Amino acid sequence: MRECISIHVGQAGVQIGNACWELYCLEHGIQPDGQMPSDKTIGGGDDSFNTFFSETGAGKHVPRAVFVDLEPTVIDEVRTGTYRQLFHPEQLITGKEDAANNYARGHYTIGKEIIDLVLDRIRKLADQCTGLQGFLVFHSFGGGTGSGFTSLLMERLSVDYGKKSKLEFSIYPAPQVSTAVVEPYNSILTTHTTLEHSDCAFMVDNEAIYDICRRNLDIERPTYTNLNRLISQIVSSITASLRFDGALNVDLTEFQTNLVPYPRIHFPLATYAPVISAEKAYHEQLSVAEITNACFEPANQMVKCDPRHGKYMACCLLYRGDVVPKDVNAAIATIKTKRSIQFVDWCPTGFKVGINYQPPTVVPGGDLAKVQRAVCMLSNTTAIAEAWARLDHKFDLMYAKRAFVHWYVGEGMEEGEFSEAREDMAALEKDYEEVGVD
Amino acid sequence: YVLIVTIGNKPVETIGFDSIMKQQSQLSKLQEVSLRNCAVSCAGEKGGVAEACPNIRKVDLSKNLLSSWDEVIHIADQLRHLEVLNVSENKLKFPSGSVLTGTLSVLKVLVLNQTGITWAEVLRCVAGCPGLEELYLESNNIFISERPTDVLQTVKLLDLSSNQLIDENQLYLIAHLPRLEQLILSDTGISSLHFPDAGIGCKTSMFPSLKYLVVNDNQISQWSFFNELEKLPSLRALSCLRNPLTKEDKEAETARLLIIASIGQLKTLNKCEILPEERRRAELDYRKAFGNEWKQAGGHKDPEKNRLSEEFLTAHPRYQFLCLKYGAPEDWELKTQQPLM
Amino acid sequence: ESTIRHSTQSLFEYMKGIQSDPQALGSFSGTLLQIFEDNLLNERVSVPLLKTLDHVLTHGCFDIFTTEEDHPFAVKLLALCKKEIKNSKDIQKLLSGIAVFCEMVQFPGDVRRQALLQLCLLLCHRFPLIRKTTASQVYETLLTYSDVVGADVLDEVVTVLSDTAWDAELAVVREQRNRLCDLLGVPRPQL
Amino acid sequence: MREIVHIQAGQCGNQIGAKFWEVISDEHGIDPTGTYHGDSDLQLDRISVYYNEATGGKYVPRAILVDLEPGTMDSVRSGPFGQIFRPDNFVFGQSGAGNNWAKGHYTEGAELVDSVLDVVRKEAESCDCLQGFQLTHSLGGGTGSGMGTLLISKIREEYPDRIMNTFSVVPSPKVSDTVVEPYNATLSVHQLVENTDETYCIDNEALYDICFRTLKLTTPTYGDLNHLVSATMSGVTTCLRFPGQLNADLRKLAVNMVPFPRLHFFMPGFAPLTSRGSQQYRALTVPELTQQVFDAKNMMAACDPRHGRYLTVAAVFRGRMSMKEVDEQMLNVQNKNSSYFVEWIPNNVKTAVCDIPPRGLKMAVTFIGNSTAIQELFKRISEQFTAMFRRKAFLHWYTGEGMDEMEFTEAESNMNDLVSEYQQYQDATAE
Numbered sequence A: 001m002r003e004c005i006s007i008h009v010g011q012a013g014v015q016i017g018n019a020c021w022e023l024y025c026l027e028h029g030i031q032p033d034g035q036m037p038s039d040k041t042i043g044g045g046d047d048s049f050n051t052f053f054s055e056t057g058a059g060k061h062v063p064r065a066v067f068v069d070l071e072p073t074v075i076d077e078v079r080t081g082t083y084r085q086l087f088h089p090e091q092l093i094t095g096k097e098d099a100a101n102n103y104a105r106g107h108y109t110i111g112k113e114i115i116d117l118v119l120d121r122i123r124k125l126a127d128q129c130t131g132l133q134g135f136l137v138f139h140s141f142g143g144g145t146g147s148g149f150t151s152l153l154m155e156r157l158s159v160d161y162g163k164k165s166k167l168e169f170s171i172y173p174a175p176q177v178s179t180a181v182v183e184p185y186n187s188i189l190t191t192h193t194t195l196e197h198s199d200c201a202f203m204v205d206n207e208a209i210y211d212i213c214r215r216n217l218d219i220e221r222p223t224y225t226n227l228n229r230l231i232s233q234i235v236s237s238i239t240a241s242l243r244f245d246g247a248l249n250v251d252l253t254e255f256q257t258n259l260v261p262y263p264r265i266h267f268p269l270a271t272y273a274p275v276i277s278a279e280k281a282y283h284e285q286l287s288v289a290e291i292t293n294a295c296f297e298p299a300n301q302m303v304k305c306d307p308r309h310g311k312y313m314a315c316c317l318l319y320r321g322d323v324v325p326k327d328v329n330a331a332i333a334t335i336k337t338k339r340s341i342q343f344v345d346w347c348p349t350g351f352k353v354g355i356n357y358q359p360p361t362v363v364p365g366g367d368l369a370k371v372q373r374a375v376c377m378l379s380n381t382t383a384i385a386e387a388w389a390r391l392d393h394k395f396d397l398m399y400a401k402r403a404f405v406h407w408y409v410g411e412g413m414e415e416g417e418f419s420e421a422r423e424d425m426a427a428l429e430k431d432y433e434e435v436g437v438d
Numbered sequence B: 001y002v003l004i005v006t007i008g009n010k011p012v013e014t015i016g017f018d019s020i021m022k023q024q025s026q027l028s029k030l031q032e033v034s035l036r037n038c039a040v041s042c043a044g045e046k047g048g049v050a051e052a053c054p055n056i057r058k059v060d061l062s063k064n065l066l067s068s069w070d071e072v073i074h075i076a077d078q079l080r081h082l083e084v085l086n087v088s089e090n091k092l093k094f095p096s097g098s099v100l101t102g103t104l105s106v107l108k109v110l111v112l113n114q115t116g117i118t119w120a121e122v123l124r125c126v127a128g129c130p131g132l133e134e135l136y137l138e139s140n141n142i143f144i145s146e147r148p149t150d151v152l153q154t155v156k157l158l159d160l161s162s163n164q165l166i167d168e169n170q171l172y173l174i175a176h177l178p179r180l181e182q183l184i185l186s187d188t189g190i191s192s193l194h195f196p197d198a199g200i201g202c203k204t205s206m207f208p209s210l211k212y213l214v215v216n217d218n219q220i221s222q223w224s225f226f227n228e229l230e231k232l233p234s235l236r237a238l239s240c241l242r243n244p245l246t247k248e249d250k251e252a253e254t255a256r257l258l259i260i261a262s263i264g265q266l267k268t269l270n271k272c273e274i275l276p277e278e279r280r281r282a283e284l285d286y287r288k289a290f291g292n293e294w295k296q297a298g299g300h301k302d303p304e305k306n307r308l309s310e311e312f313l314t315a316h317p318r319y320q321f322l323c324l325k326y327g328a329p330e331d332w333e334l335k336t337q338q339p340l341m
Numbered sequence C: 001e002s003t004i005r006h007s008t009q010s011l012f013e014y015m016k017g018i019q020s021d022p023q024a025l026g027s028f029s030g031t032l033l034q035i036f037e038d039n040l041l042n043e044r045v046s047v048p049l050l051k052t053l054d055h056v057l058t059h060g061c062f063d064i065f066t067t068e069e070d071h072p073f074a075v076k077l078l079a080l081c082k083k084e085i086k087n088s089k090d091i092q093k094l095l096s097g098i099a100v101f102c103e104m105v106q107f108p109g110d111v112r113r114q115a116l117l118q119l120c121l122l123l124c125h126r127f128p129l130i131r132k133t134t135a136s137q138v139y140e141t142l143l144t145y146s147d148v149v150g151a152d153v154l155d156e157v158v159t160v161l162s163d164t165a166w167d168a169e170l171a172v173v174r175e176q177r178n179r180l181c182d183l184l185g186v187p188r189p190q191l
Numbered sequence D: 001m002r003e004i005v006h007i008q009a010g011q012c013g014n015q016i017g018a019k020f021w022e023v024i025s026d027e028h029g030i031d032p033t034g035t036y037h038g039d040s041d042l043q044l045d046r047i048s049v050y051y052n053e054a055t056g057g058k059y060v061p062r063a064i065l066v067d068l069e070p071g072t073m074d075s076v077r078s079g080p081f082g083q084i085f086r087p088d089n090f091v092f093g094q095s096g097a098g099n100n101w102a103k104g105h106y107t108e109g110a111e112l113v114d115s116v117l118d119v120v121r122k123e124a125e126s127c128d129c130l131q132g133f134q135l136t137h138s139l140g141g142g143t144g145s146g147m148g149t150l151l152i153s154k155i156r157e158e159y160p161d162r163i164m165n166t167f168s169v170v171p172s173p174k175v176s177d178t179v180v181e182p183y184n185a186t187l188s189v190h191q192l193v194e195n196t197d198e199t200y201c202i203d204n205e206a207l208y209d210i211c212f213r214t215l216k217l218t219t220p221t222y223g224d225l226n227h228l229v230s231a232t233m234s235g236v237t238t239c240l241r242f243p244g245q246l247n248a249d250l251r252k253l254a255v256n257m258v259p260f261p262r263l264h265f266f267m268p269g270f271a272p273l274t275s276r277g278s279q280q281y282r283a284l285t286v287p288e289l290t291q292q293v294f295d296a297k298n299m300m301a302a303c304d305p306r307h308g309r310y311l312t313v314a315a316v317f318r319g320r321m322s323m324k325e326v327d328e329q330m331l332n333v334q335n336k337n338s339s340y341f342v343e344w345i346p347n348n349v350k351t352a353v354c355d356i357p358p359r360g361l362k363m364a365v366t367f368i369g370n371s372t373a374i375q376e377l378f379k380r381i382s383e384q385f386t387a388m389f390r391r392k393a394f395l396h397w398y399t400g401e402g403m404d405e406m407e408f409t410e411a412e413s414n415m416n417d418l419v420s421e422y423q424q425y426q427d428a429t430a431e
């Protein structure tokens, strides 16, 4: 077996990791204090949950996570939370100054006096693992800290841990849920600084998840808490491939070979179904075909795009719960007869399907109901490039008058970094269209 | 459980299918069975199901050919570890109280949606399962003519949606329940609910432990329902979406803050936590809205000059509470906008 | 502000010397109209020119052209202004137009009546601020020039422009507009 | 816990700082002895931003007062609240700079600049995490004009990662008849542009005209202007001392309100306008306050906000008004079809709502915008700076201390370039 370490960064990152760990504990049955009455061993090596959690002699389960934040406002609440005895104090690192929505800070001003300590803490967890696969980064492009500090840590690790995979779960900023006016600069800087430090990266449109929570879940004003509970489901469905004894994308290296054909292109679209509310629990029973067909709905997609107007390079379907291959064959045939999608003839990868005998789970009194089946579709299509087009519009307009640019150059940054980052974005956009040439 | 294609220009790579096929073949380890649209009429020879699948936690007998309730009771007897059950979309014929007890001694969930069951049969069918928590009864046209006595005691959840034959008279019968934490009433046609057994400020013994309440898709057009809801001893949560008052318009938000003002123990509304600032803003808006009405029906800052009619006390019983929380509205706060020439 | 304050004072000092000579004033007005015609539908020179015309008319520079009915200069000026105020949406450009239309009522003849009609078209605009500004400018012009409306009807026009909320719904403002038109002799507009 | 170090220099600077501290102490509920006696828990959740928690539950201010002349020092030491300021935070000499900028920045004010750095460094060592320094002085004089610039230039070299905010008080011929004021103002602005991220301009002519017309006071003294200055200062620093949804720190506020490096001068204001003595007379509402925040009469500078573009807009409300009531009012004034719509109240404005109201008033409002009209404050000093430079009047005093015409022409060119950039940006496309 092989272990894994999740490195969370920023406010959004730390808020998403707590919910993910809570969902994992509710699924595997881990108690708040860290006691698995079903486990019949004291140490890890023969079970299956040892990839994410770590066992000790006293039966305590210490989640393999490295939470690092600059503002202690959120870490103080995360420490005194319900799972105070779960996470180790050494894993939680806090700073003394906030970036205040700035990348040149989270990277050079506030990222220099914290990086020398983050590595010493990550080494303590890396030495305990006999075979580490890679890293599971959780941050957001909007937040200045979550972007700058994450990019600094990523490249810092590229030197030491070079022969290790790298993953990401960023959150694409939206105009409605915007905390900074410099969101476009930080995003275009972090996408260019770590375009080579990420083997695979997942983007979460704040608009798509908000619309999903407002329509599907039927919520008036979905708060960050509700948006984090919904993303936890997708995170668990994605990590089930490595947590359980499955047979599809069991290792982080398999993600770069079955989803990321081109090293440069590493932004695969993801979708998860169904999305039933708690009130309408036993209202309707959707079979595998319905949930598989709902994946092709722009409203249900995690990012606002139009895959219909684009080719497909790699596609991976993952079923969870009561699902039989006989029923999955019906959906596979319907995808071809009813629906129709083209494919890139120059792409090596193709279509893959997998099933896992693990039913879903929801938090007591939550927003989502305990459905009987779940489906997760990961498709790498060029349509996602549209999401990168609008992002370049705002940045370009702002840098046309060079507003809020002096605040970055005067914090350990050069004026040429912006030109380099948008020259890289232009090249990526051009390659996105060149890959989908008839 | 005991038993190529190309999309566009590429093949489908089904991997791990053999593992799932081998795991599902073991009938002696199926912790969850689902037979939707599988034609299940009878249970078969007794003793076989108890030996082939002696461990079952959840069953989904929805959309089957179950004609009689005895066929379901037979399967429920062999399944000792039956926790969750669902027999929706079945025109079963229940007996006149002949179902013996002990068949469902560990049934925590029971869904009976779309079954044509009546209130007289629900009590007879929930006779052999006192530890029943969830009990769904949606789309049944049930008429609450009787009331529980020795059954339906630990019913933590009671769903009665898609039933346009429920009113306050029928709710009073199922109001003396001891453990009633949830009572869904979506699309029930209800429009008014009062508590004559309690006065202004005093609580009511009906629905004491009613924590979460749902009343979506109803004719809720009066603020008399929200005003009556305050009498409930406990009511931390409420959903009132898609209604004549809380419509999808832009000004509908103005009604939201009103609800938070009509209830004091409302910590969440429509799955949205009400932070202290939100409650303060709602209370301030509610106090500023009826500022003119509070003075029209008598009222002054000095306790000496004060006389509120019964109308203002029954329509706004919580106004006096805010009067002491944020003082009384002065003469300058009652002029937020006026025309000019 | 300071630049405009200085330029206006410097221009008035020069205009005071060419105020009696009709040839100089005529040449200046012709050059101004030519500049206006050249930079038409231009938001770089049209707004400044319209703003300067307001001050030029308020100071009383074109006082010799007021002793003649149907002056070609004031006719072409009003024609160009109507062109520049055609569908005007922005409120910055509408303010200067309203000011010019109210500072042009001084010229008697067909320019006095027609110009007044324009004011009516601005009393029932699409925004209440425009209506209020037009009403205020009309009230100010009625007090400035007294020979524009007779004394017998001036009282009614003054009373109608005072106790009337010009920032209300158009359903009630149209009645006041029609009443003011019936008193000022302006023909009833037509949608 | 973000702390801020407040520094005061010059007679006018110290007089303004003392009044501002007294105001923010009376508003927070702190008796002149040192203990706390307020009646609200919100007056302590952010008291550490400007008060150190010493032994015995006392709150020690953080005001570092410096003055070459031993005048205002003794007055502040024996003031209504003189017993609050630490006693070794007072740094003074005997003879000042004699209304010469080359004296309080090179020969005299650079003689106590070393004791100032030791004091400001001893005060910051106790803080857990410093955010940014602060200074309150007047462009007129030598100890306010030269000492402030010297300290700003000396602190930026040792703390480049700290925000630098000032409260320059531009003089006016009406308040003072000194003739060596234009040079001191020009040389101060020359240094306040290349080593300052934010500068709140409080022109004296504006306050003089306000006291002459609005307040209708007989002979407006320095106290009337100091009261308004302290009121504006307390109204500006409302988010940095009280909770709220808009948790805009100093760096975040400077980044969101100052898009350009050189352009950073604001036009602070405050409403309603009051005076000393009585105050309770009329209770204002939210509409009236919004209509008055954006009037050039409520501004503390001789500039017309309407005449000029709008770089960044911001407003802070104080009283029982709700951010929901404020948003309703801020979304109908940026619309033409809306009634009582204003053309000078711009769009994308920042807005705040406070609970604790000011002293002697139940509802108030503060405006912190940056309009191009501020250029008028820079041109008025330019003319007076040129007419006196061609004749080389009072230039021997500057050339004898060490200065030269090079610095004068450099400051003149910098001011001209700033005015040109302001005029160019004033004519910009809205969309």
Ligand SMILES: Nc1nc2c(ncn2[C@@H]2O[C@H](COP(=O)(O)OP(=O)(O)OP(=O)(O)O)[C@@H](O)[C@H]2O)c(=O)[nH]1
Residues within 6 Å of the ligand: A009, A010, A011, A012, A013, A015, A016, A070, A098, A099, A100, A101, A102, A140, A141, A142, A143, A144, A145, A146, A147, A171, A172, A173, A174, A177, A178, A179, A180, A183, A206, A224, A227, A228
């Ligand atoms: N999905 C999601 N987005 C979040 C969350 N918290 C913040 N965001 C978004 O992320 C961006 C701001 O990032 P933050 O995490 O607040 O920034 P940070 O990493 O703390 O760094 P600073 O700039 O110093 O505050 C905005 O687009 C927010 O809307 C969260 O919990 N979930």
Ligand SMILES: Nc1nc2c(ncn2[C@@H]2O[C@H](COP(=O)(O)OP(=O)(O)OP(=O)(O)O)[C@@H](O)[C@H]2O)c(=O)[nH]1
Residues within 6 Å of the ligand: D009, D010, D011, D012, D013, D015, D016, D069, D096, D097, D098, D099, D100, D104, D138, D140, D141, D142, D143, D144, D145, D169, D171, D172, D175, D176, D181, D204, D222, D225, D226
């Ligand atoms: N508003 C206001 N302006 C003041 C005050 N005191 C002085 N001024 C103005 O500031 C200028 C004088 O500067 P001061 O602060 O007195 O001088 P200084 O900084 O101590 O410098 P030296 O004269 O060199 O000792 C003149 O323009 C005064 O009108 C005051 O209390 N309030």
Ligand SMILES: [Mg+2]
Residues within 6 Å of the ligand: A010, A011, A071, A098
């Ligand atoms: Mg943060």
Ligand SMILES: [Mg+2]
Residues within 6 Å of the ligand: D010, D011, D069, D096, D143
């Ligand atoms: Mg002095």
